[PDB]
Ligand binder design. Sequence first.
Ligand SMILES: CCCCCCCO[C@H]1O[C@H](CO)[C@@H](O)[C@H](O)[C@@H]1F
Length: 158
Amino acid sequence: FACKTANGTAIPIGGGSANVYVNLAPVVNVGQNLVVDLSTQIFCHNDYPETITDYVTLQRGSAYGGVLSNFSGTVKYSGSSYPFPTTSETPRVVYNSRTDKPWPVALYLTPVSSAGGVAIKAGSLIAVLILRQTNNYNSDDFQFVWNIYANNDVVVPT
Ligand SMILES: CCCCCCCO[C@H]1O[C@H](CO)[C@@H](O)[C@H](O)[C@@H]1F
């Protein structure tokens, strides 16, 4: 089991960490969602599907900078919605193929009432998402740490 970003940055067998640079809607109104779709950014595969079933969860998701201060979040994992920052590990997503499959993570961020102006700064850390991988074969328990950075400023109109 290993993962890669849309740009080619890979995390090999055993896990580790990588940076994900995301373009964000430049203008988000109060009452609207800022959608951060990581399913188009992070792709994973099973290296031995003939024998092994890989189990994948979002172990935890943390918010930073402008996202923590200015937004109310929800994380959608494989069609199910949960609070973001996270309060529990999600159910497992099965990886049973050698073909790259998107990691089904999407953040839904709505501005808080106090938000106004530059709510997210360009180049800032916005989230850290922990992909946890296990299997039905051995004691392997690996963490694929995804550091999410904003490519641009996000303005919340006043
Ligand atoms: C003849 C025995 C061959 C042993 C195959 C081990 C390959 O391990 C890697 O890929 C696995 C499948 O994706 C992961 O379950 C595992 O945790 C690790 F990432």
